[PDB]
Amino acid sequence: QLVESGGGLVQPGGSLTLSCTASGFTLDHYDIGWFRQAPGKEREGVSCINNSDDDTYYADSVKGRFTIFMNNAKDTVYLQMNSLKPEDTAIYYCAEARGCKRGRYEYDFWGQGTQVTVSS
């Protein structure tokens, strides 16, 4: 049971910080993935934090621009998005992604996600 926020309208080159929260409940016991679904495109994995092996994964398209992390609270998983591009325009969702396994499509999405729009 995860809840996304932090979306909005941003100019190309700009920055947003998304959040994924389970409200006091501690997420550091789970592996969490960020996903997005853009218009005309299929659902895609963006980033994943592996809390069992203390590791992080990124799609080739966002490498070096996006960072996934938690703070001390440990109840929220953040997605820092830098140098945003139009191709990043999408609804962003989080979900449990055990082991951040790269070849999986089906996840349990309980959130409404949060919309990110990148335009001039």
Author numbering: 3 to 122
Q: What's written in the study?
A:
Similar to other nanobody structures, BC2-Nb features an especially long CDR3, which contains 14 amino acids and is stabilized by an additional disulfide bond formed between Cys102 (located in the CDR3) and Cys50 (located in the framework region 2 (FR2)).
Since most of the described Nbs have conformational epitopes, we investigated the molecular mechanism underlying the observed high-affinity binding by solving high-resolution crystal structures of BC2-Nb alone (2.0 Å) and in complex with BC2T (1.0 Å). The unbound and bound BC2-Nb structures are similar and can be superimposed with a small overall RMSD of 0.4 Å (Phenix structure_comparison). The CDR3 loops in particular have similar orientations, with the exception of two amino acids (Arg106 and Tyr107) that are flipped almost 180 degrees. The β-carbon of Tyr107 is pointing away from the Nb and the aromatic ring is involved in a cation-π interaction with Arg45.
